[PDB]
């Protein structure tokens, strides 16, 4: 029984580890049309049929919000945004003093003061000549110089550049792929808690596509909940944590920017093309969005049913609009058609719930200069886009916050919040965990090596 | 009894493939002095003893216009040129409005209107002080504002230039095989651009190839081994450039007889700028010499070669250039650190039928340059002092064949094809990059010994 | 019976060679703060057991002034410095002329004119607006154009100033040879710069060396184990630098007795610039203090060690600097994130023959040219409050006056303005060789016939 150990290699070992993600796309499908920020100039093509493999007799743990692909990919999109915006020109000259007027031509009376026609004293490409140039601007992007003279709102902030318009902002599915010697653990449980083991497990060499959707209050174009609307958070007792909600069935939303924009080109300097919005054709109409009602009641009621599992299920559940603050979390944002929108979802949360016509329209705002992400060290000017913008998108989830001070386990309340993009990226990447294969191993046996 | 397969490793495979060429230089002989764009002051040096290996009993196929080291090196050159320009300072402030006048006195009568003297409102290195400076400008570089003139490119991308000490002289380069990869060459003295080559050889690492930039004439090219070779993707198609390669060199002399001087200019804090100072002595147009009889006999050999694909009674006509962008209208080269544009219509005013000693061409200088076909970049030629003189070998031609020519008679040609991809093909046509797959299998009599 | 050569593997081999050295820092201790100029965002943490073993029966050839790791040091430090300088703001706007005045605020009579109140019509956040802003400047950073002053470095490379969050305090950096290479060190405490070292040891990684920047005397360096040592690859060549390494430290204080106040103005969008604010209280000179008796006892020990290389009763004298660029003219070093310059002439005013504290005035410069480079220039951010500095003197760099006759009356002077010899002072103990585990030898076997 004097056993000896013996070396085994290629044996199945996991080790919790973090490494850099591998960019991937299905056969580089973005090559069909140029040019896209999120797909960049190039990325590695991948097989259209990754071999998903069901690990039977297997249980393993996924500690959500401890996973590092989210932060790594957060840095990746920050870097990609910076690299896409590096080559294109700067816009420091714009905020010389502005002489502005008071748009009343072909305007709807509910919007008076949203747009300003301003003129200024920037120069031409010639170093010793100036030109009088005028353009319209949304009121959200400008402020009065004194208590009128106007200036661009973000000049006493960091520098401002133009998004050069040749490259689109549309999201494209991004595939994350394991480096050699790694695999991507994936859960199969249909109701899987954000934390805790998953009863049935599968792994893939390489993951499916996820759109880098940028949104602030509503989850858009996300994967649908597999069986039922479901809610996750790090700890429901701690109200400082954002409340994740995933919809079981999608809710379609229509959004258009109904007016004809016109665009004009201005020379700032040699090789410096600039774009500004020209006169608008037709009566000016506020951009807005459309959503169904009975379905909104239906999704919210299902949300209440699932919320009642974490509370005494006779408790009152109520929604209300955001508590205020910066508009980036006070208002819902999305980028359809390559343009920035801020929509007043306050009407979506005007309801109450207790124990036991067909559409909704929402006003939307427009801004051109953006403080992207949570950075304050850059500001960027999106191009004017001619024509009528139109977006159709799927509503797939919610991000919520719960008010504190609740007593006696009654009257639980919620508001939209937690606008950090990390939470959307968790909501999308929650199925995966990078892991290390350690093929070498040892074990006892009855084998004794042959004598030399 | 029945045969079994066996594993053979190291067996020589040829697989058509592409990888990135490894830079190389001839022992870094230039590294003693600075600085060279085409050498980056250094590449990996190579031994003087690569050994070409003959492949007896071996034939293999080549395909020009389909090989890829050409465009690989094309983007290599674009990258190197941009890298060299990047550290240098921009010249954006220069196109402030200029008051100008014509150059007068001490001039050749054939110079009238070529040079212009302009002044600036342009400021000092101190942002609060101004100065008035002047420089001598070529006519071709400047355009009227509506006398007043402006630099022509300040309604396209901006112009940058510094680092004048860096030389533009070309260097031998070896695109030298990465490990596991080889370079093979056709040994046939006369070979089509495509098709198998009856005798082939391999090298571990390539011959010296020059990065020279030329528009209408092939310069410093390798000589054709026996006869003036004519190559193209398809002779019948007139959209394909016709390659002409000499088997004998044709010397060409060129110079700038003007004694030039330079003035250093400070525009910003620590950013030196150079302007062309007043020329010493009489002005004389830059010109180039080639030998008359050599040109005639060479073109006679060329038309004899042209007769091979055509009817023997076809009249070979050569014609004045077609026009268009100046860089395809006129022959251009950079030798001596400065760019030129010369009238080659004199060289191609002749016709050929079945059965004193030199030639001089007027030539042009442009100091504002758009390299390749790019629009987003532009640079300024630094003034070079004194008289420059260059001697070089004319080694080939890049021609286009006109359309029409009905009833198979009176074929005509004109210079064209400004793409340097074709030049670099004309040199690199000998080589092909192939993949060595050392592993293999084969039947044998081995059945594995038990235990 | 005849012998045949065998092949061995793993036999330790050494070839005098060079590779790029590893980055190594102690347990990544800098990561707790964001961030040191040299340590930056990340580096490899040190091994918890930097094991070294003395080599039995090995003497090894060492060659100071020939090791190329010191050039790697110079290049890598320049690279790190420019890496940290790069994501910062240019100050080309500052070349505008400044109206200046000879302001004082209860100033001492020995600094009158060392500070100037300069104002200029400046830049606003808005291109079409201008505003007048003033700040206090040292006279040695500015120059009369033909009073109106212009800052001294506008007829040279451009000036950049930003990124105050980075730290200029040296951090020990350990270096490890690449795998397949090894580090060799001399165990002889009395070892020359060159020659065989009788007692040797090898280590996975070198010890910590702080990237100290000094021009006349060494700081923060390792102490000599037993006695003061003097090194130079050829003492007969006076143009070469003379190394001096102390075995006992020499404490030195340096301070700028006043608080400093800071103001910040915007060149434009994202163009934060820090300027020296008005300074309150009595305005006094930055200065350094060193003990007298110690400064003898170390100098006398240096003379005693010095007499080894010359004939007995040779007269030894020190004098004040012969002049040149201010960097070699005065002793320069950075502490508290700020650059200093001091007139070290006082402490060389002595002579030596056979058989309580010193106070030194100091000067401040803000526009600084790194090393001997002219292609870059920067402005030093103001450092708030009174800077207080406690530091150790561990060695000096000297030059020998040429000429004389009969090998007597030797006179020495500070010099060697190259910091190459500053890092040599620490790196001299180390070499890296190449290991090829392969070997051959004769033997009595034959491969079994199959």
């Amino acid at each position, epitope marked *: 029984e004097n056993l000896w150990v013996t070396v085994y290699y290629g044996v199945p070992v996991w080790k919790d580890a973090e490494t850099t993600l591998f960019c991937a796309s299905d056969a580089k499908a973005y090559e069909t049309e140029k040019h896209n920020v999120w797909a960049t100039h190039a990325c590695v093509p991948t097989d259209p049929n990754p071999q998903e493999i069901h690990l039977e007799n297997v249980t393993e743990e996924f500690n959500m919000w401890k996973n590092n692909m989210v932060e790594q990919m957060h840095t990746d999109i920050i870097s990609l945004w910076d690299q896409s915006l590096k080559p294109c020109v700067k816009l420091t000259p714009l905020c010389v003093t502005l002489q502005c007027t008071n748009v009343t031509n072909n305007i709807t009376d509910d919007m008076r003061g949203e747009l300003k026609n301003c003129s200024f004293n920037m*120069t031409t490409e010639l170093r010793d000549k100036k030109q009088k140039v005028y353009s319209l601007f949304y009121r959200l992007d400008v402020v009065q110089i004194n208590e009128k003279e106007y200036r661009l709102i973000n000049c006493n902030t960091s520098a401002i550049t133009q998004a050069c318009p040749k490259v689109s902002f549309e999201p494209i599915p991004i595939h994350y792929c394991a480096p050699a010697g790694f695999a991507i653990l994936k859960c199969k449980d249909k109701k899987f808690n954000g934390t805790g083991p998953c009863p049935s497990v599968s792994t893939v060499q390489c993951t499916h596509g996820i759109k880098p959707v940028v949104s602030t209050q509503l989850l858009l174009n996300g994967s649908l909940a597999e069986e039922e609307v479901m809610i996750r958070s790090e700890n429901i007792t701690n109200n400082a944590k954002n409340i994740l909600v995933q919809f079981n069935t999608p809710v379609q939303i229509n959004c258009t920017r109904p007016n004809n924009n016109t665009r004009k080109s201005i020379r700032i300097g040699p090789g410096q093309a600039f774009y500004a919005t020209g006169d608008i054709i037709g009566d000016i109409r506020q951009a807005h969005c459309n959503v169904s009602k009975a379905t909104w009641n239906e999704t919210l009621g299902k949300v209440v049913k699932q919320l009642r599992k974490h509370f005494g299920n006779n408790t009152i559940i109520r929604f209300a609009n955001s508590s205020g603050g910066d508009l980036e979390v006070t208002t819902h944002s999305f980028n359809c058609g390559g343009e920035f929108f801020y929509c007043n979802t306050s009407g979506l949360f005007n309801s109450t719930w207790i124990s036991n016509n067909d559409s909704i329209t929402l006003p939307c705002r427009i801004k051109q200069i953006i403080n992207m992400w949570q950075r304050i060290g850059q500001a960027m000017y999106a191009p004017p886009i001619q024509g009528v913008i139109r977006c159709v998108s799927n509503i797939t989830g919610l991000i919520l916050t719960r008010d504190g001070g609740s007593t006696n386990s009654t009257t639980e309340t919620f508001r939209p919040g937690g606008g950090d993009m990390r939470d959307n990226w968790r909501s999308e990447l929650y199925k995966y965990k990078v892991v290390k294969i350690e093929p070498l191993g040892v074990a006892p046996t009855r084998c004794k090596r042959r004598v030399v | 009894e029945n045969l079994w397969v066996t594993v053979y490793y190291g067996v020589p495979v040829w697989k058509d493939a592409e990888t990135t060429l490894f830079c190389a230089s001839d022992a870094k002989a230039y590294e003693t002095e600075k600085h060279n764009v085409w050498a980056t002051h250094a590449c990996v040096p190579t031994d003087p003893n690569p050994q070409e290996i003959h492949l007896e009993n071996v034939t293999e196929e080549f395909n020009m216009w389909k090989n890829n080291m050409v465009e690989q090196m094309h983007t290599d050159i674009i990258s190197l040129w941009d890298q060299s320009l990047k550290p240098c300072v921009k010249l954006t402030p220069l196109c402030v409005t200029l008051q100008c006048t014509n150059v007068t006195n001490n001039i050749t009568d054939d110079m009238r209107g070529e040079l212009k003297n302009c002044s600036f409102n*342009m400021t000092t290195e101190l*942002r609060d002080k101004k100065q008035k400076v002047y420089s001598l400008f070529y006519r071709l570089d400047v355009v009227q504002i509506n006398k007043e003139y402006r630099l022509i490119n300040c309604n396209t991308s901006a112009i940058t230039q510094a680092c004048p000490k860096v030389s533009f002289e070309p260097i031998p380069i070896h695109y030298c095989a990465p490990a596991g990869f080889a370079i093979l060459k056709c040994k046939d003295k006369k070979f089509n651009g495509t098709g198998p080559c009856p005798s082939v050889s391999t090298v571990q690492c390539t011959h010296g190839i020059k990065p020279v930039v030329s528009t209408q004439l092939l310069l410093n090219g390798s000589l054709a081994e026996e006869e003036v070779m004519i190559r193209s993707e398809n002779i019948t198609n007139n959209a394909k450039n016709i390659l002409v390669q000499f088997n004998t060199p044709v010397q060409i002399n060129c110079t700038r007889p003007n004694n030039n001087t330079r003035k250093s200019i400070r525009i910003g804090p620590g950013q030196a700028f150079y302007a062309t100072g007043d020329i010493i002595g009489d002005i004389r147009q830059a010109h180039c010499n080639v030998s008359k009889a050599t040109w005639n006999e060479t073109l006679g050999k060329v038309v004899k070669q042209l007769r091979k694909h055509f009817g023997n009674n076809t009249i070979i006509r050569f014609a004045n250039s077609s026009g268009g962008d100046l860089e395809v209208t006129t022959h251009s080269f950079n030798c001596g650190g400065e760019f030129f544009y010369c009238n080659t219509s004199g060289l191609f005013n002749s016709t050929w039928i079945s059965n004193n000693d030199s030639i001089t061409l007027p030539c042009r200088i442009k100091q504002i340059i758009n390299m390749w076909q790019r629009i987003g970049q532009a640079m300024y030629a630094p003034p070079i002092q004194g008289v420059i003189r260059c001697v070089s070998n004319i080694t080939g031609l890049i021609l286009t064949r006109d359309g029409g020519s009905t009833n198979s008679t009176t074929e005509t040609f004109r210079p064209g094809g400004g793409d340097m991809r074709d030049n670099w093909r004309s040199e690199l046509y000998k080589y092909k990059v192939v993949k060595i797959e050392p592993l293999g299998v084969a039947p044998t009599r081995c059945k594995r010994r038990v235990v | 019976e005849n012998l045949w050569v065998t092949v061995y593997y793993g036999v330790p081999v050494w070839k005098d060679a060079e590779t790029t050295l590893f980055c190594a820092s102690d347990a990544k201790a800098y990561e707790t703060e964001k961030h040191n100029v040299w340590a930056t965002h990340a580096c490899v943490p040190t091994d918890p057991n930097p094991q070294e073993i003395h080599l039995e029966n090995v003497t090894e050839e060492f060659n100071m002034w020939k090791n190329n790791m010191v050039e790697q040091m110079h290049t890598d430090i320049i690279s790190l410095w420019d890496q940290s300088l790069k994501p910062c703001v240019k100050l080309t706007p500052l070349c505008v002329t400044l109206q200046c005045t000879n302001v004082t605020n209860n100033i001492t009579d020995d600094m009158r004119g060392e500070l100037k109140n300069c104002s200029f*019509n*400046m*830049t606003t956040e808005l291109r079409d607006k*201008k505003q007048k802003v003033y700040s206090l400047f040292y006279r040695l950073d500015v120059v009369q154009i033909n009073k109106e002053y212009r800052l001294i470095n506008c007829n040279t490379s451009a000036i950049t100033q930003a990124c105050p969050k980075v730290s200029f305090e040296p951090i020990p950096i350990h270096y490890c040879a690449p795998a397949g290479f090894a580090i060799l060190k001399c165990k002889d405490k009395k070892f020359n710069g060159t020659g065989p070292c009788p007692s040797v040891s090898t280590v996975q990684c070198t010890h910590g060396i702080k990237p100290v920047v000094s021009t006349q005397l060494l700081l923060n360096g390792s102490l000599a184990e037993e006695e003061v040592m003097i090194r130079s690859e050829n003492i007969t060549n006076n143009a070469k630098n003379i190394l001096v390494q102390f075995n006992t430290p020499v404490q030195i204080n340096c301070t700028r007795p006043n608080n400093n106040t800071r103001k910040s103005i915007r060149i434009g969008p994202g163009q934060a610039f820090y300027a020296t604010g008005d300074i309150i209280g009595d305005i006094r000179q930055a200065h350094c203090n060193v003990s007298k008796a110690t400064w003898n006892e170390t100098l006398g020990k240096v003379v005693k060690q010095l007499r080894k290389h010359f004939g007995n009763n040779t007269i030894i004298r020190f004098a004040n600097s012969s002049g040149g660029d201010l960097e070699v003219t005065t002793h320069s070093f950075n502490c508290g994130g700020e650059f200093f310059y001091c007139n070290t002439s006082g402490l060389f005013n002595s002579t030596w023959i056979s058989n309580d504290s010193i106070t030194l005035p100091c000067r401040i410069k803000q526009i600084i040219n790194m090393w001997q480079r002219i292609g870059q220039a920067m402005y030093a951010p103001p450092i708030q409050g009174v800077i207080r500095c406690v530091s150790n003197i561990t060695g000096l760099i000297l030059t020998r006056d040429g000429g004389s006759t009969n090998s007597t009356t030797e006179t020495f002077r500070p010099g060697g303005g190259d910091m190459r010899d500053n890092w040599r002072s620490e790196l001299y103990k180390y070499k890296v060789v190449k290991i090829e585990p392969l070997g051959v030898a004769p033997t009595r076997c034959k491969r079994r016939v199959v």
Partner: nanobody
Amino acid sequence: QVQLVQSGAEVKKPGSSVKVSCKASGNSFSNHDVHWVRQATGQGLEWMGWMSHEGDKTGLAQKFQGRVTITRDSGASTVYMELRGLTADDTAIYYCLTGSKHRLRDYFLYNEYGPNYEEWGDYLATLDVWGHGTAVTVSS
């Protein structure tokens, strides 16, 4: 109408200096350009000098270089003028009057990373309401 006050009539010896004072109600010098003009009986008007309303520019006729200096009190509530070297032919009527000018960029140069280099100039628009004037004469 902004009230204007001038110095009274004065007789001065040959080869000696003379000074005058000037006032305007409401401290209107900050908004109107200060000006001076001399005229003798039967002769045309002669411009002597000016201050800008900002008080940042001064100027003189080339005939009066080295003989005339212009000063004002703190807050520019009054302006003063000093004449030097008067002779018998300097006898004339000396006047105050406010003025208005045009300030325009005469040359300029946009700077991407710095202030726009600018050359500015003052262009007087018209001569505003005159003062009652001052009479000075030279005799033994």
